[PDB]
Amino acid sequence: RYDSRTTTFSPEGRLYQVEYALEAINNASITIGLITKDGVILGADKSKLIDNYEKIYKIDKHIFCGVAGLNADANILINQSRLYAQRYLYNYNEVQPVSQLVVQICDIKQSYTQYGGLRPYGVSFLIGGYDTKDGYQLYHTDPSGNYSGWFATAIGTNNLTASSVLKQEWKNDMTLEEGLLLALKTLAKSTDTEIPKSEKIELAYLTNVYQKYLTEKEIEELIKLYTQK
Amino acid sequence: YSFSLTTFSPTGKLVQIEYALNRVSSSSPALGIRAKNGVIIATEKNELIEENSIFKIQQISEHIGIVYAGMPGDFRVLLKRARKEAIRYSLQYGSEILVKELVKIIASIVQEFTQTGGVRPFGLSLLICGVDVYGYHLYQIDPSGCYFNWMATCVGKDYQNNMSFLEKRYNKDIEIEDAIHTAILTLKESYEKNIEIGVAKPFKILTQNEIKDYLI
Amino acid sequence: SYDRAITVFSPDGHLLQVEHALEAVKKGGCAVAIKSSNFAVLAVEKKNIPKLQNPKTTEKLIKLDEHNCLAFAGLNADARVLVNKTRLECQRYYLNMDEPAPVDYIAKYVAKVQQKFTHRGGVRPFGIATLIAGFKNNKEICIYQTEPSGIYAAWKAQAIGKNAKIVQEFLEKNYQENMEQKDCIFLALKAIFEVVELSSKNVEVALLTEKDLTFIEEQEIN
Amino acid sequence: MDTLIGLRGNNFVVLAADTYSINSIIKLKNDDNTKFYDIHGNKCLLLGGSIGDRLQFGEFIRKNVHLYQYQNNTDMFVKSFAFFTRKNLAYYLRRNPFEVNCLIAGYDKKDGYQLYWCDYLSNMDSVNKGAHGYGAYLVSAILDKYYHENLTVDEALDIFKLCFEELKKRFLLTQINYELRIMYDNKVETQYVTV
Amino acid sequence: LYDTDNIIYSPEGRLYQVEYASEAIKQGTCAVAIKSKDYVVVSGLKKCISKLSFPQEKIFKIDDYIGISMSGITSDAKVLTKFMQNECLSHKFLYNENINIESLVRSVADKYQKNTQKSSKRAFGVGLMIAAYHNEPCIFETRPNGSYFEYDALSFGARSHASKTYLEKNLHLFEECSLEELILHCLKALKCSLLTISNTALAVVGKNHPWQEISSLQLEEYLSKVK
Amino acid sequence: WYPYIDNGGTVIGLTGKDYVILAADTRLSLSYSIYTRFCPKISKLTDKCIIGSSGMQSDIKTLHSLLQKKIQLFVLEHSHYPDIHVIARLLCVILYSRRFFPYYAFNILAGVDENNKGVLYNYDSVGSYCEATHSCVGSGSQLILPILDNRVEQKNQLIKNTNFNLGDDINFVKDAITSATERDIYTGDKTLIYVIDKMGINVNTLDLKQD
Amino acid sequence: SIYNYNGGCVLGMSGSNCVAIACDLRLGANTFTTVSTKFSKIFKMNNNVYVGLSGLATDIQTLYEILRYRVNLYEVRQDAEMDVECFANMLSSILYSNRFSPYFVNPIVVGFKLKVNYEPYLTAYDLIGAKCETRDFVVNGVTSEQLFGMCESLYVKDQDENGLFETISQCLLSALDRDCISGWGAEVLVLTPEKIIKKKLKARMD
Amino acid sequence: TTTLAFKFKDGIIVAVDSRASMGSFISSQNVEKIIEINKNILGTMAGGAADCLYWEKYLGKIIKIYELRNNEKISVRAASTILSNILYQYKGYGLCCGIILSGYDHTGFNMFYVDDSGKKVEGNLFSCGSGSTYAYSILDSAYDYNLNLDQAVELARNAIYHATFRDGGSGGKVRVFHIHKNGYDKIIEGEDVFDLHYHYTNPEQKDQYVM
Amino acid sequence: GVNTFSPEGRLFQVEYALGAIKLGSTAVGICVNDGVILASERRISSTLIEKDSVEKLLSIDDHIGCAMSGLMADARTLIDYARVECNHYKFIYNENINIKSCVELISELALDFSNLSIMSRPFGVALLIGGVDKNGPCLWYTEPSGTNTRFSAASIGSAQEGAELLLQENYKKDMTFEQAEILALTVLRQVMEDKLSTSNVEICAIKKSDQTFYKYNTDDISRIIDVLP
Numbered sequence A: 001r002y003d004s005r006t007t008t009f010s011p012e013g014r015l016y017q018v019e020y021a022l023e024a025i026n027n028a029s030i031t032i033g034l035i036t037k038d039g040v041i042l043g044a045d046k047s048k049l050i051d052n053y054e055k056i057y058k059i060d061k062h063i064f065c066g067v068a069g070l071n072a073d074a075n076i077l078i079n080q081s082r083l084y085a086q087r088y089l090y091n092y093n094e095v096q097p098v099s100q101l102v103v104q105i106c107d108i109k110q111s112y113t114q115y116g117g118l119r120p121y122g123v124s125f126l127i128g129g130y131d132t133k134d135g136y137q138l139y140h141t142d143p144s145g146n147y148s149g150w151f152a153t154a155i156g157t158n159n160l161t162a163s164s165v166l167k168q169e170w171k172n173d174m175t176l177e178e179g180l181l182l183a184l185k186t187l188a189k190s191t192d193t194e195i196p197k198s199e200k201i202e203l204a205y206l207t208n209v210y211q212k213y214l215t216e217k218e219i220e221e222l223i224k225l226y227t228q229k
Numbered sequence B: 001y002s003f004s005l006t007t008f009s010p011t012g013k014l015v016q017i018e019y020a021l022n023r024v025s026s027s028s029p030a031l032g033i034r035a036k037n038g039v040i041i042a043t044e045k046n047e048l049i050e051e052n053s054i055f056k057i058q059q060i061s062e063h064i065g066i067v068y069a070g071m072p073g074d075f076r077v078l079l080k081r082a083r084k085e086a087i088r089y090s091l092q093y094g095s096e097i098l099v100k101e102l103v104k105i106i107a108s109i110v111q112e113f114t115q116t117g118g119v120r121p122f123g124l125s126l127l128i129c130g131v132d133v134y135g136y137h138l139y140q141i142d143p144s145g146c147y148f149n150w151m152a153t154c155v156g157k158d159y160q161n162n163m164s165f166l167e168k169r170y171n172k173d174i175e176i177e178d179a180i181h182t183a184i185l186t187l188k189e190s191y192e193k194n195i196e197i198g199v200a201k202p203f204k205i206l207t208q209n210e211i212k213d214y215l216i
Numbered sequence C: 001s002y003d004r005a006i007t008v009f010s011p012d013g014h015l016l017q018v019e020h021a022l023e024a025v026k027k028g029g030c031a032v033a034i035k036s037s038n039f040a041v042l043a044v045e046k047k048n049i050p051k052l053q054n055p056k057t058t059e060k061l062i063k064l065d066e067h068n069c070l071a072f073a074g075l076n077a078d079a080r081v082l083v084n085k086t087r088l089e090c091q092r093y094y095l096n097m098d099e100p101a102p103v104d105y106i107a108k109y110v111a112k113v114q115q116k117f118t119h120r121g122g123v124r125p126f127g128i129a130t131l132i133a134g135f136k137n138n139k140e141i142c143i144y145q146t147e148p149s150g151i152y153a154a155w156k157a158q159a160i161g162k163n164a165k166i167v168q169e170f171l172e173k174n175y176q177e178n179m180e181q182k183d184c185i186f187l188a189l190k191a192i193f194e195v196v197e198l199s200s201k202n203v204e205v206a207l208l209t210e211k212d213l214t215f216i217e218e219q220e221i222n
Numbered sequence D: 001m002d003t004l005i006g007l008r009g010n011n012f013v014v015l016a017a018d019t020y021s022i023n024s025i026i027k028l029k030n031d032d033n034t035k036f037y038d039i040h041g042n043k044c045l046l047l048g049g050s051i052g053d054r055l056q057f058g059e060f061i062r063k064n065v066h067l068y069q070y071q072n073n074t075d076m077f078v079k080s081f082a083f084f085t086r087k088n089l090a091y092y093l094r095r096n097p098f099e100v101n102c103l104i105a106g107y108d109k110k111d112g113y114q115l116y117w118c119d120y121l122s123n124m125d126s127v128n129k130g131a132h133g134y135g136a137y138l139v140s141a142i143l144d145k146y147y148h149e150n151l152t153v154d155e156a157l158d159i160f161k162l163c164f165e166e167l168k169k170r171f172l173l174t175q176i177n178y179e180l181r182i183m184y185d186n187k188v189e190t191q192y193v194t195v
Numbered sequence E: 001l002y003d004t005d006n007i008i009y010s011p012e013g014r015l016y017q018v019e020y021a022s023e024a025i026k027q028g029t030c031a032v033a034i035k036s037k038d039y040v041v042v043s044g045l046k047k048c049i050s051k052l053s054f055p056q057e058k059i060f061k062i063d064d065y066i067g068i069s070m071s072g073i074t075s076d077a078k079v080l081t082k083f084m085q086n087e088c089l090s091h092k093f094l095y096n097e098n099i100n101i102e103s104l105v106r107s108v109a110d111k112y113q114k115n116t117q118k119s120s121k122r123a124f125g126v127g128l129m130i131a132a133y134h135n136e137p138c139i140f141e142t143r144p145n146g147s148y149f150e151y152d153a154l155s156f157g158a159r160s161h162a163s164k165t166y167l168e169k170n171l172h173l174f175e176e177c178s179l180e181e182l183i184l185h186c187l188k189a190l191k192c193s194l195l196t197i198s199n200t201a202l203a204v205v206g207k208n209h210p211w212q213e214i215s216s217l218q219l220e221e222y223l224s225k226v227k
Numbered sequence F: 001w002y003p004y005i006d007n008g009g010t011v012i013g014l015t016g017k018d019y020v021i022l023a024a025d026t027r028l029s030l031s032y033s034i035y036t037r038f039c040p041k042i043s044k045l046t047d048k049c050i051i052g053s054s055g056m057q058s059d060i061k062t063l064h065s066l067l068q069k070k071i072q073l074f075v076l077e078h079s080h081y082p083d084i085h086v087i088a089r090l091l092c093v094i095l096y097s098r099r100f101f102p103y104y105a106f107n108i109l110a111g112v113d114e115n116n117k118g119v120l121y122n123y124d125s126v127g128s129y130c131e132a133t134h135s136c137v138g139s140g141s142q143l144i145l146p147i148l149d150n151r152v153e154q155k156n157q158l159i160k161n162t163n164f165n166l167g168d169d170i171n172f173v174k175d176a177i178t179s180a181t182e183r184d185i186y187t188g189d190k191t192l193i194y195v196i197d198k199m200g201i202n203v204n205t206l207d208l209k210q211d
Numbered sequence G: 001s002i003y004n005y006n007g008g009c010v011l012g013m014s015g016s017n018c019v020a021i022a023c024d025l026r027l028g029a030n031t032f033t034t035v036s037t038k039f040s041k042i043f044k045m046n047n048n049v050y051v052g053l054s055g056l057a058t059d060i061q062t063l064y065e066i067l068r069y070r071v072n073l074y075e076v077r078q079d080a081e082m083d084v085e086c087f088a089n090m091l092s093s094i095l096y097s098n099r100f101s102p103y104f105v106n107p108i109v110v111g112f113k114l115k116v117n118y119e120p121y122l123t124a125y126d127l128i129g130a131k132c133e134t135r136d137f138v139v140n141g142v143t144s145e146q147l148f149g150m151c152e153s154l155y156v157k158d159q160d161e162n163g164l165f166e167t168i169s170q171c172l173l174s175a176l177d178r179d180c181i182s183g184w185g186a187e188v189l190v191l192t193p194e195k196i197i198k199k200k201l202k203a204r205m206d
Numbered sequence H: 001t002t003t004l005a006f007k008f009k010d011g012i013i014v015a016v017d018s019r020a021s022m023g024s025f026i027s028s029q030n031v032e033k034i035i036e037i038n039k040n041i042l043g044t045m046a047g048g049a050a051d052c053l054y055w056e057k058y059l060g061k062i063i064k065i066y067e068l069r070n071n072e073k074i075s076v077r078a079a080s081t082i083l084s085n086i087l088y089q090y091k092g093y094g095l096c097c098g099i100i101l102s103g104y105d106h107t108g109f110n111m112f113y114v115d116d117s118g119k120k121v122e123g124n125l126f127s128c129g130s131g132s133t134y135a136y137s138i139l140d141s142a143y144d145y146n147l148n149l150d151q152a153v154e155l156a157r158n159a160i161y162h163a164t165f166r167d168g169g170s171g172g173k174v175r176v177f178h179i180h181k182n183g184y185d186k187i188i189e190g191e192d193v194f195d196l197h198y199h200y201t202n203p204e205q206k207d208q209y210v211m
Numbered sequence I: 001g002v003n004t005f006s007p008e009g010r011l012f013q014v015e016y017a018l019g020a021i022k023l024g025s026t027a028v029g030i031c032v033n034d035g036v037i038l039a040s041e042r043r044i045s046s047t048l049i050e051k052d053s054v055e056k057l058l059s060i061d062d063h064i065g066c067a068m069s070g071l072m073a074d075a076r077t078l079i080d081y082a083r084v085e086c087n088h089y090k091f092i093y094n095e096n097i098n099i100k101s102c103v104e105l106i107s108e109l110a111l112d113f114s115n116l117s118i119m120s121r122p123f124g125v126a127l128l129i130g131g132v133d134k135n136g137p138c139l140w141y142t143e144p145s146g147t148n149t150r151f152s153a154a155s156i157g158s159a160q161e162g163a164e165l166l167l168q169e170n171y172k173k174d175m176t177f178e179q180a181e182i183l184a185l186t187v188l189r190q191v192m193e194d195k196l197s198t199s200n201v202e203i204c205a206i207k208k209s210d211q212t213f214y215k216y217n218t219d220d221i222s223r224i225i226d227v228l229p
């Protein structure tokens, strides 16, 4: 009588828990990603006494992830993803391809929607990475274990406006700096602000592998550049 | 028999976590202030109860201390668990557990109770203050299992006003004692027998005489 | 619901969870499979947002093992999990039997797995329907369709997913038994395009032969 | 008693093994088919030891690798394949171990032609020329003397003929039938050398 | 709201699920058991669900000197029958003697009671009458609630009120009745509930007479004697 | 601690056209001492099938009790008595179930099948078995099997007499058990002879030497 | 005798602001057949932590994989490099978790403790993680006696990177030339706070 | 025990002896060593009689279930793989099985040699048992693929004879089955080798044959 | 719950399962001294199916056949369990299992969801299991309630009532095997709506002479149609 039946089908072939988790993520802060020739980009918008990346996390030397949704579930899944990457390296003596890690983490996501009586993870990921077989890859993963591959996408609040801006501006032959400027422009557009503030920005990029996590001053420099244009 | 009692609401919220947050917000005030050379955690508490037996501030390890706002029993359980995890890290690596890693492990343990079946979330919020080779850290752990990195914060009743007070009196380059005075002022705004303070040397909890010496 | 029964009998005798898994299958994209003398053609619908979604990431036309291929309609994550289980069973058979898994054996294994998930406590039914094409031990080609309930049946030409009834009715009037590869592919395409918007980006068609499964280059689709 | 030979060049890799299946003091067969295990993707696992252990370990490895290559829809790298094989051999080293000697050969675009020598203890290393079995004691030196990194495949096969001749003349088991895998120019060839 | 779970009590201090399991016993076919100083005779009505049907088995042999009749759900009856048969055989294997009848009945009652205390389980929906000869003709009745009793005569199933009344009228004869008259008494009790060789089952057990079903010709002549 | 002792004693089986004879001694002994002068080795399984085993007595008794338990359970479950062949496969499986800690008991399963022909299955400890027209297990088996081969087969005699009757077979079995008692220290005391034919099982006793 | 199957030897030494880790390059079989000569026994955990594993080859590889797994997990979770002393403690605990069925490996840990001040850190181990932390040199492998003689007679305190390279290479080569089952090439790594020098010595290959 | 099988123009010839012995004592000379797995596949028994019998009947059970499930006849390769995989799960427990699975499937006539060690050697001429060496020698000296059914039967009979003649553990009766496209036939149900010695080697029968 | 009694003393779940067996194609089973014959209709859903891939008549063993009604996915699981158990009996005892024993095994499996002493619900299947054992030919009926009833002649499926009525009308003990076939197909013709044809029905027979499961081909069905009134 106290059981909620989290792993049951709704009358429409829909899972109510998965839909509500999707809603919760849609109410999360916006995270974006796009592919350049130089590498992958992930942008994200974060009281004055807060000291501290809370949207972008490193999974492996060649994989990193932007988060949307519940932060604690995101931390659990990030830890488990790091575990999978390291176990792949342990088993095969080679780095794990990005798609394989995405499939493993999404399987863990989905088993919570098929097995047991627990709730799903209320988190969605933008997994960016580089491997030799498939070059640079960006993946979107939703709470139900479905995933998709993208050249540029957005998650979180107002993802439609960011998606429209990305589609209108994202080219194939854009360099790292142009990609970063586009990322800042999308972050500003989705906030409905003419200028993006340099305290609500989380930018990082992965290139061939090395990852840069931009400090506030480098963000300020990128803001100056974006403002000149 | 094992099924989640914490479930997504139709709007995407975890109402049990929101209710635990309400409970913590209706709890006694605690706060922390990270100084340039140290970090302090302070808290506020009938002629019969022994004071020494109900200290909210506790010691996780020689350089790590913890305070809470919420349910005392949950705090006792989580304190024993945090001590266990610190000792496990010490056995593994031969050094004191780093503050951030302890915060992550306890955050994972707290999040587990928001998803596993047949358990309610922890009805407490934690402030963990510690020193490691990478400086002084002051972290807050929520009932949800998320951990924030702070320079200063308050986690109990009327904590909006206390947060505003700390904001209007916080400077990074502050001695330990300037921070201790600011903390006492903040607690007196929320409100020597009513004050418990711990400071980071190995983590230390101020004696009643010392606290009164600060109240002058 | 660790061990709570999810699929139960309704007062009328129905297993509502299976009808809901059927609804999940109906929500999915259309796929079509057509059998010939010694080869098959599988054409599935694809829908991606142009210029932003990588079109190579999603593969609903799945190779299972050396000789057997699969297509599905329904929930994608459930489909991936069931496909991985099927691949594991194909290799387990080829290890214990020393012979590759025949199409009928694989289809029966998928059907029994779906039935099991429909008949165990603490598990949700798979909301996916599959078309599995392959070769039997006698080297004969066969196409099987498995449903969420766990029922399976062999077909000459079958369509699954959204608007499957219309594609079935079309294929009934058009499937002229043995057909050449080119026009068999054309039939597999003009049947699926009766429901999906006419565009080379709204379909992927592959062909299974005794040698291997080959995806058709987009020039021919154009 | 299962002689295995492996040779690696800049543009080829050749595996070789006698084709005897033995049972006690009798040859069950003079054309074995349980030592070589071709793995899709220009990979090959040449196992020596006991027929039961060879079959079990080789087929376990082969089906796991094919399962990997089907689930991921990609070819496993030869180095990943070799280290997966060594890992699996080491896992069972202390629990019902397979007493099998292994040569792993392959070709990749990432590391070129690749040869790996692994013993029943699962001591594995990449080599340019390796041997397994008692016959090793009579062929390794030959491979050392006549090898250079720029050998053509035909010169490698002549060196293999030298090895087979020494195995016929000096090795106590007058082994005369051999099977060779030749991976080069993207193609994998099977050859049978008698005497 | 109190009949929903197996482990709940009503305000009246009643278990409604167990009482429903017992109500499942009223719709079984009538069976009757009676005893004299040496024998127990069990007679039951076989259910017939169509003309082309073969009559349902009504009595079962548990051991050389132990048999049973059932009323209620048949699958639960088969489970209990297998339990009892394996118990008697395990006793005869471990030791070299027949099982004490009270012990077997008490173990069956334990099996009944166990199911009543857990939510995941439901009570056995069948009532069993056990007829045996362990130094004496003995009739036991088990119930879903885990309680069992010992009877001089017993009947249960559909319309056992007529069989009851007949047995209560004739109880004082059974002790001093002979085997043939005891059989005829049980058959007349069974007839009150309404017999042919097909729709009636009849077995006897007693002193130096292992559990044995009455043959077809014997049943025919006995039914003629009833007429 | 070695968990196996051999209690001695012999069982001899012999089949005819429609009858089977199983004669076993009853002495129970340990090393050079006698536990007792009467411990039956032959058990009745059904009215047309018996089993007689030699080896370690406790194993034999447990095996026989388990066979009887399983046969009665089979009767109660499938509502018919098993044939001797069904019992034979059942006992083979029961024996092989302990393949790695085997019963120290060699067995002879004698009976009359549905077609009223004498059937004799001989078993070793781990389950291997075969049908036979004459068998012998126990200490005296190596002494007695040639006698049975010389009388029932006559492979090495040109002039052969084949017409045998039940009385002749019973007297021959008595002579064979007498010889076993004469030459085997572990064979002696009273012997029980079971004769199975259409009418069922008949048990007779014969006294043998007591030394 | 298990260690005689593959042979091998590892040698760590320290100087002034520099440290050195050297190993032999042989992989043998059945104690006398040299099957490889490129089998390096030195593995890099991070810029400031190196390990040298000697003993059974399979155990060396398994332990290296386990150590890499643990170190990569630690570093990613902390966003910082593992401290050398913490790595040594972790290696000891990993070794002792298998006390009764151990990895037949005799590792040495070499590197720099960071305080910036780069203090050389060395420590030897047995197969069950018995600490042998030392400030001058550490030895493991079958050539342990010869190596102890070399580092006893020839070790000089506070040598620059060139002096340390010369001393360690001479010690290793002289010890190896008296060992049947170890040799066939020598690898030497000299770490300083800014750069690492890797050299392959010209040694006997007999 | 001496079992052999060889593939020839008209199918497969399977031949066996029938002796089971316990050390130096011949316990039986009427053992059936050619076990029917299914209607088309035959197996032989060499080594542990209990192990071979139990595991070949178990393989028959698995095969019957498989055929019922998949509405198809299993191949010799698949059955041999199943048997080898099952026998490998018991590696180290002392199972002693030498079996030759020979049959006809959709891929033709097949013959596999499987022993308890896990072997699965495929071939067209095999022999198992203490007399396997003599059988191999005789078969190799005169094996031809285009032998007629009669010629193949004679060759198999002579090889079995010679093995029994030189080998202590082989003898009894020679049984020869012929596997063809439609099952198998008992060409020689059983022939005592006593006659075969005085047919092949000492036909004049006027003095002892000298080896 | 699944294990809940009703106030009348009947389990709700098996009661609901009773409505499921009423669906599906109709089968008829007739037992005569010479053997047992099971004949089933096939309501072919479309012309694109391979008619013989859908099977209503299966062989639990060489001497046992079964006609299936209700949820076919559940029925296949039941028949597979029956096959495994019958082969296990054959291996342990080296004889063909009695038909009633097989039906009782099927029944004990069918009610395994109760957990009195693992499936989660009742099977919702009706089995018409015929065979020939030492007792001769026999025919049994099993339903989700777990009660198994021996029948001289019986019918199952959508037109169960009509087929049963006809079989009662036209069945007598003294019947030849050919008369059994003729009667089975007469009832089948009268019940099905699709006109009877050589491709519309399955006929399987287990005869006392050989006790072997024989599935009819097109020639035999055409013969019986040629003999029909």
Ligand SMILES: Cc1ccc(-c2csc(CNC(=O)[C@H]3CCCN(C(=O)COCCF)C3)n2)cn1
Pocket (backbone or CB within 6 Å): F006, F054, F055, F056, F104, F105, F106, F107, F122, F123, F124, F128, F129, F130, F135, F136, F137, F138, F139, F141, F142, F145, H020, H022, H025, H026, H027, H028, H031, H049
């Ligand atoms: C395949 C097969 C063939 C024969 C037998 C079999 C079992 S018995 C028998 C005939 N008799 C003997 O072979 C005796 C020979 C001496 C050793 N024997 C003992 O009984 C001594 O052990 C005392 C306690 F067990 C048996 N043939 C079983 N399977």
